[PDB]
Design a protein around this nucleic acid. Sequence first.
DNA 1: CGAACCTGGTCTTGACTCCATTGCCGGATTTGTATTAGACTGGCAGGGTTGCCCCGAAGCGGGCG
DNA 2: CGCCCGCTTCGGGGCAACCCTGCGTCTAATACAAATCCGGCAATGGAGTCAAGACCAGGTTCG
Lengths: 1266, 87, 108
Amino acid sequence: GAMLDVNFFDELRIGLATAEDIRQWSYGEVKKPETINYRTLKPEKDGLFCEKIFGPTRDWECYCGKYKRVRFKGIICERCGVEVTRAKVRRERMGHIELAAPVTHIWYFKGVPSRLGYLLDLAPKDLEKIIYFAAYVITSVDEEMRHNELSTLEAEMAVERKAVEDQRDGELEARAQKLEADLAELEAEGAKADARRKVRDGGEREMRQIRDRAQRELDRLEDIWSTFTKLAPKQLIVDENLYRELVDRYGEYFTGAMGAESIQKLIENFDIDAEAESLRDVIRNGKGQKKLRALKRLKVVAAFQQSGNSPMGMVLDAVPVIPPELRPMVQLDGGRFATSDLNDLYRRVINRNNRLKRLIDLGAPEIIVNNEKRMLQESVDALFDNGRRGRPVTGPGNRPLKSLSDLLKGKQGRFRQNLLGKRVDYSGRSVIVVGPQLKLHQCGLPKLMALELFKPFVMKRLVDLNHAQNIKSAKRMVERQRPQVWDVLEEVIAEHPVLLNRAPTLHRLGIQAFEPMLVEGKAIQLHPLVCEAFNADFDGDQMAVHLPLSAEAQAEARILMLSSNNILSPASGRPLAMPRLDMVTGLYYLTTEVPGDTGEYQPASGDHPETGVYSSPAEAIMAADRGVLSVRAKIKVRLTQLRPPVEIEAELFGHSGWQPGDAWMAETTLGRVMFNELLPLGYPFVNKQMHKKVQAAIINDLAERYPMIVVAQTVDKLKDAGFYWATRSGVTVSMADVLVPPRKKEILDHYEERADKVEKQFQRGALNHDERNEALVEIWKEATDEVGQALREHYPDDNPIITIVDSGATGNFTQTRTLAGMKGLVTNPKGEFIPRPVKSSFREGLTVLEYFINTHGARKGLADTALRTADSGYLTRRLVDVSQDVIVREHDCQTERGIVVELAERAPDGTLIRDPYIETSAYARTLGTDAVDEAGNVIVERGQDLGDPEIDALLAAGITQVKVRSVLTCATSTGVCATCYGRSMATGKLVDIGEAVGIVAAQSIGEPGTQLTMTGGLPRVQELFEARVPRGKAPIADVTGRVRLEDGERFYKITIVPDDGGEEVVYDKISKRQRLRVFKRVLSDGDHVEVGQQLMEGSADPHEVLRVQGPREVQIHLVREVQEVYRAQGVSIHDKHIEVIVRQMLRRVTIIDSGSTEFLPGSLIDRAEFEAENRRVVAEGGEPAAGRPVLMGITKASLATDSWLSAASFQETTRVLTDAAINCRSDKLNGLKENVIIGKLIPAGTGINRYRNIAVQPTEEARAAA
Amino acid sequence: DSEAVVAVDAVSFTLLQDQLQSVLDTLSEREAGVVRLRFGLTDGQPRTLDEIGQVYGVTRERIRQIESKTMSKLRHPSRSQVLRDYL
Amino acid sequence: RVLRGSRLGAVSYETDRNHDLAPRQIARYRTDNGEEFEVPFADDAEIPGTWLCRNGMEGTLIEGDLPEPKKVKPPRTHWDMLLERRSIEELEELLKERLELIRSRRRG
DNA sequence: CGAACCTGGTCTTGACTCCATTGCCGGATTTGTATTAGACTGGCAGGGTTGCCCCGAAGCGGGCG
DNA sequence: CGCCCGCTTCGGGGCAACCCTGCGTCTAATACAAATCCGGCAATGGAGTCAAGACCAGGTTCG
Ligand SMILES: [Mg+2]
Ligand SMILES: [Zn+2]
Ligand SMILES: [Zn+2]
């Protein structure tokens, strides 16, 4: 235990609290339903706010006011009774309520399954009748006294029954005498024989009433005798009159109570080991539903037996009281008080308890006391969880009161808020503007905001320099903004990084540090190259600025999270600080080449020489400053500062043509020389045309072969040159620049005539509605593509609308077709194609109906955008919640297993064509085995990074399949090892020994989900990670052999003939809307298919491919199916980000044979735990369990964790917390979710013990130097 | 929460306590002793002139004279501008 | 615009000294069911005889000094409500009539 | 070099005096309990939505005759 | 050759967890006792205050 809590923790053990611990935490029994005085506004004695119980409201003062000094501390006043202490002890001191009659907990009774009902084996609809005073129960029985006195008791029963028999025989004889007198007085006088027969029948009905009343009395006596024979414990006696008839007879032979005291007595006289071993015998010797119910009860029975708990605490005898600072009664300005909505529940409990105590002391009939105890029980139930049993207790205006459990569950609970995050000091936000003069590690700052962030720093600094006498005059000097505070602010701002942040933070680069520098105005200036990482444009977006404080936080923001340190993706490794929209156009115009421009080099040498050469780029720059040389004309310079390409270098100098002194001629433009001067010295000459993919390749090569600082400076230089030449490029937009195709109208008339013939053929009746809709859709698609082709071939190359597109700056060609040309088909609200279509363009201007048709697709796109970003956020939450505990732990696990990569299969001619999906699948991986070629030399040994040149060497040697290491085959138990993960994509080097690769993988998967524009969209990914059954479930085979393909009536009956002698597996309901799978041609009857061959077309459920093709092949299928989705949008995700998630699915195994070691069938436990005990239990008890690999989704595997504190935050915080409380489940605080909650240091990055305990001391040689 | 800690007045109180200790140390030993025991600056109990004259072995009137002399000594601009700026 | 609140409690700022405090005694109180509790009272202070314990029931002092035990009266009975409205002769009339009725119902 | 004096804290004593500390008493106000005799004898949020788990008919195949 | 009987399979029911088609004024006092506030003198007794007035000790001036 620990009550001071000085930051050293190992375990957080929950457990079920008892009455002794409840009355041992408490500081006094609250016994009045009073809160505060209405006149003097002070807490009442023995109330819900009492200063004797909870402590003093004012610091170091008793209630009567006798002691007021700190010298009196720790003592208790003699009169008022308040211990003098701080006023923060009212936050922590608890009190208890003494109930007059016991009360069941609502949590262990009204859940599924009901734990009280499982522990006693009673039905819940009978337990509800017991604890709500609706039916008695048999709390005890005495079988031996009934056993040895039952003869005398049935003798007295026979005596009473024969007395009833003699009494009814006397009654029948009296009615017989009266009917004899009726007959004698009827047949002696003149009377009607019909009335005489009615008189006789009346006497007969009288004696029949006698005999069936006697029969009913005998049935009552034999029924109470049958129940007294069958008197067993845990029996309900409904309607209470049989019970009252059964108490007064033989009260001394049994006891029967009603309610929570009866349940307490039933739990009191209860052995747990007896029903434990009985359920062991039943699950040993059972079959069917009986064994399943005995298993589901043995769960909670062995839960109560195995721990050191006791079942007494499910009935409750003392209720604790939460401290009054957590439920404060605060007044506002003006006396409008504000209570906290639990005080009403506590007041109802106190009132009904006091009334029950008064009723018991008074002495009342049973109806009043039972009604009062029922009301007490319902009050405690409403206090613990309102709205569980029937209708909730509501307040003013039919609003339900927030009960005590509603502070935890739901969206407004403590857990969901504490995972949602807090609000911070030292922060600020503003709108953002572009910062095109800053360096890459800089950011602007509005000085009126930076004066507010750095206020204690500037106060200390202008106290230290003598400008104010203390911090008070310094604070007033800051508030009045005297003109010295600006110089002091610059002095304290220099070299002190800040954090920048734009919500929503999608991935790891959403928070990046910067060095501030003061900027006039009021908007945050942002560097124009991080907009791609932030996903921020300048249409009015706002960014938050935080501030690191300590030395550790400053070092983390300066080294880890700097802007210029994060150039590449964490996902795919491509750079994010690449040039974009304007500077790409600038460099494209600067590096393109015009044939026959001004000053072009011609070699025509008749009377005059060539006049195209230039001795130096300085001479060329002079000749272009004068109006002679254009920048894009082809010349022949004599360069002496740029490295020539490989062919010219090997030609002219051979070994190393170190160009800092060497001279060589080159036929280029001036513009490519001016461009290549931005690049470093060691980088060779380029001599190309700077398309965006060419710049991507250049910056990728620079990031691969050079340090990071050279890449940052090169990117800054490229930004400056790109902007400066983007202005001079002359890319404007005029409506004389949006040219129409000349022969558009004849094309439209020709396709209009074809559409007219199709419409006339429909009007003849030769075809239905849908066929003519398909024909018109096909005709207008052909017309749209024809107009697009004519527009593509009509335009020149120097058109701005085609230069911006073809240089890869922005946009595609379809937007230019809709600008000039034809819009095309427009969709319906549902998704059908309107067959009209729009035959205009936005240059020509639409008409009214065409605009009205276009609006449908526009609004559908907008609503699709909103729904898609919500679903992407939810999927990112699920993935982070699953894979947060996969961190790198070791450097090399030293396994031998590994996956195999395809890696550029060959041609029918035999040539090794390069596979397109190499850079996502095979790159940045470490080889598990060696690479041998044609049984010759080993080209690339084991343990290498598989970058570019060794992949090129393997392809040059002519090998395809390679066995590479991956995180599916890693052998460490807690997280993955460093060699299995391979190269971290964000750095380019090997991953470190503290990285949190799970959250990196989860963010890299969940980030581009907003661009997934669609079962083929984001539900296709979500139904793959959840491992749900699909919709178009095409079947798979189980064994080889020719097929018995049979196409039945309206649905197919596909049977497979096995290859060997085996059964013929029949597939029942295969509807004709599904299609035959095409492979190697279409499917035919008798096709010799493989083992796990997909039968129809569609998507197989991965549960079936696991059970058929084992654990290796399902990992190949699950990656390739997800990676087929992201390739539809051209989104590049490396496969190791998906292989982390798929690794978390197959961690567990099912149990079919329990063996002899604490096991149950149907359980899913860890593979590393199932085998490890089976390593030991094969000796001394050698009944090994039978295991099999199972595949569970992300939502299922996230719940079954080892920490109750993490799983409480997910879902059903009621249900997660109650069964953890039964089992006394201790937590170990090892995931990085729990360490965030308690505020401890997380076990990742700079938090693990290899890095947190570094000793730092100066070198002993340099120690003596000063 | 208007009854919370403003977190600048607390460090202002600590700085004021330190400056008060230095200013009282610029006086003599007996003067600082009688001022601290008069105003309870060290334990929180304001003693009277009887207790100060008991702990120093002199009349209550001598203690009162010394206290008035020290209060006149502290009421100087040179000795007290740094304390004037705290209010 | 902004609305402020205030709990009714003064907040001081001092130094939590651990060394020089006002000294204090300790007395043991005893409840009915053998419970003992220790209460630190101040020195220059009267020690009260009875004291409401942490348990919630009233607990006397562990050293026998004999304070005033009850000094109270029973509040009111239904017999008092009967006696303040009728005479004992009327009560004996009803008693003798009921005795004759139970006699004639039992053996008569 | 010796005597007279000025003024430094230093300290006692006599007188004044002033304000907290109980303390009593009478009244004002404030809060808590008992009492009202014709006869009067079983009510009302409330449903609706969505999703998932547990038991019952039912084919049905294997044991049974 | 037909027939029972539990085993598995799907249906239906039942139930557990979340929003609004949600969101009223009421006899009327009296009688009395106890507790508590509080207002105003009525003893102070200790604590502060003024003033005289003495106490030498070492510069300061004068012989
Ligand atoms: Mg925007
Ligand atoms: Zn007090
Ligand atoms: Zn490994």
